[PDB]
């Protein structure tokens, strides 16, 4: 029961969805991990006297 | 298109009726989940006040 | 309740995507 | 019989049918190949109003233009009493206000004018894409207009949000956005020394030179008995190189895009990461190849 037989039945078309999902997930994970590391290892503000 | 009811025969094909049923069920489930999520969010922190 | 709500939403997202992906790719 | 040529010349005595312009328009005018026709299955406005094509993005664009003009004229005639276009002063809200807008406070109509202008520009770009799709053409004109539209978007949306005050936007006034340009250029002193501004200036000068040379080349072989190779022989005697009929247009397109792209990059970088372009070049005299090689006024 599909309206996209060319996307949901073909092996090539069926791999589009998974590839896109994994790419989006990996991009988000990369950004999150980098900024978490930066904000966790960076020093505290340089206070005044 | 013999699975379609008499009223909606001029509008729906046999293959789209099942997908329409799936979409309706998904919409109802999403509505239930959204209702529970909104109730939990209000129970945590009211946004109107 | 910041972590708990995030965990709940992420779990819902993962379970829903698993269900829909299983429906599509079968 | 005299045949009027496209250049306007008439010569005595091939498919050279002297035909009107109506036939050409009627042959190529066919409906149903725009962007919205693929998305919704139909373009809601698929007609021509005079010579202009009115698509789904023409109505949005025209609404944006009308609202922008009205909001511009309201602030400058009313709320300022200037009554002359060369002395009105359409400013955004103050920097102390932050990123939030308020109808009661001043600077509200600047926001509406900017939003309407952005909508109109985006609609114009999409309508050009639609018209290019209807004629079976390439997508290069939309690419150039998108470059300039991104140049617009960087100055009024991305930079103010990155700075975080919403007062970091040039006023929409004739002879007054020059004031903003002059004060921004001197706050970060020596905007000449910004590396990306220099690249933009270089590409602008190259664009003008290339355009003038191409015009001179085409006009010089207009209405003479020429073998189509004389211009190449001319361009090879002078400068020792000829680029060809298709190469020049590609060069013009690419340079015209690249200049504005580099300029938008330079302005954005000047906004946020650097505070003084003179201190940017302080690393040059300190690289470990020239450090101890001089004496007196000659050492750095």
């Amino acid at each position: 029961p599909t309206l996209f037989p060319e996307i949901t039945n073909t092996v090539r078309g069926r791999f589009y969805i998974v590839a896109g999902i994994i790419s989006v997930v990996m991009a988000v994970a990369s950004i999150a991990i980098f900024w978490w590391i930066f904000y966790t290892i960076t020093p505290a503000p340089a206070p005044p006297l | 298109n013999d699975l379609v009811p008499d009223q909606w025969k001029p509008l729906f094909n046999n293959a789209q009726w099942l997908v329409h049923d799936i979409v309706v069920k998904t919409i109802y489930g999403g509505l239930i989940i959204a209702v529970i999520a909104h109730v939990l969010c209000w129970a945590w922190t009211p946004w109107i006040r | 309740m910041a972590p708990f709500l995030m965990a709940f939403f992420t779990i819902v997202l993962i379970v829903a995507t698993l269900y829909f992906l299983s429906m599509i790719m079968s | 019989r005299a045949l009027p040529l496209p250049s306007g010349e008439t010569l005595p005595a091939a498919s050279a049918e002297v035909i009107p312009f109506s036939i050409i328009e009627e042959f190529y005018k066919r409906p149903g190949k725009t962007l919205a026709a693929r998305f919704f299955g139909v373009d809601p406005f698929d007609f021509w109003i005079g010579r202009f094509y009115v698509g789904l993005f023409g109505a949005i664009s025209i609404i944006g233009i009308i609202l922008g003009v009205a909001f511009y004229l309201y602030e400058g005639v009313v709320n300022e009493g200037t009554l002359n276009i060369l002395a009105m002063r359409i400013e955004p809200p103050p920097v102390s206000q932050g990123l939030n807008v308020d109808p009661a406070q001043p600077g509200f109509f600047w926001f509406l004018t900017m939003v309407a202008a952005t909508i109109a520009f985006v609609g114009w770009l999409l309508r050009q894409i639609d018209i290019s799709l209807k004629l079976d053409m390439g997508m290069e004109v939309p690419i150039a207009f998108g470059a300039v539209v991104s140049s617009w978007i960087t100055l009024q949306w991305l930079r103010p949000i990155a700075m975080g005050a919403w007062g970091h936007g040039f006023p929409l006034g004739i002879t007054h956005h020059l004031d903003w340009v002059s004060n921004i250029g001197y706050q970060y002193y020596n905007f000449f020394y910004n590396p990306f501004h220099a690249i933009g200036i270089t590409l602008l000068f190259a664009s003008t030179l290339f355009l003038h040379m191409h015009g001179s080349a085409v006009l010089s072989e207009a209405k003479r008995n020429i073998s189509d190779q004389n211009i190449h022989v001319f361009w090879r005697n002078i400068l020792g190189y000829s680029i060809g009929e298709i190469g020049i247009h590609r060069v013009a397109f690419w340079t015209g895009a690249a200049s504005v792209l580099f300029s938008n990059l330079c302005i954005f970088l000047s906004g946020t990461f650097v505070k003084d372009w003179n201190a940017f070049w302080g690393f040059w005299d300190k690289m470990p190849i020239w450090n101890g090689v001089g004496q007196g006024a000659l050492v750095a």
């Binding site: - | - | - | 009027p4 040529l5 496209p6 498919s15 050279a16 049918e17 050409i24």
Partner: protein, 47 residues
């Protein structure tokens, strides 16, 4: 008092009106020449 000096009149507004009128005339004449009839390849068979 409220009037601009003569330099402000001429040097700034004579060129401005000249530019606007010249642009509006050049556009009209170029469109006239481009819409005039002359030798064209027949669109029915050329492509």
């Amino acid at each position: 008092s409220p009037w601009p000096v003569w330099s402000g009149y001429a040097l700034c507004f004579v060129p401005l009106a000249a530019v606007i009128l010249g642009f509006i005339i050049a556009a009209r004449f170029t469109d006239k020449q481009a819409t005039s009839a002359y030798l064209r390849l027949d669109p029915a068979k050329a492509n």
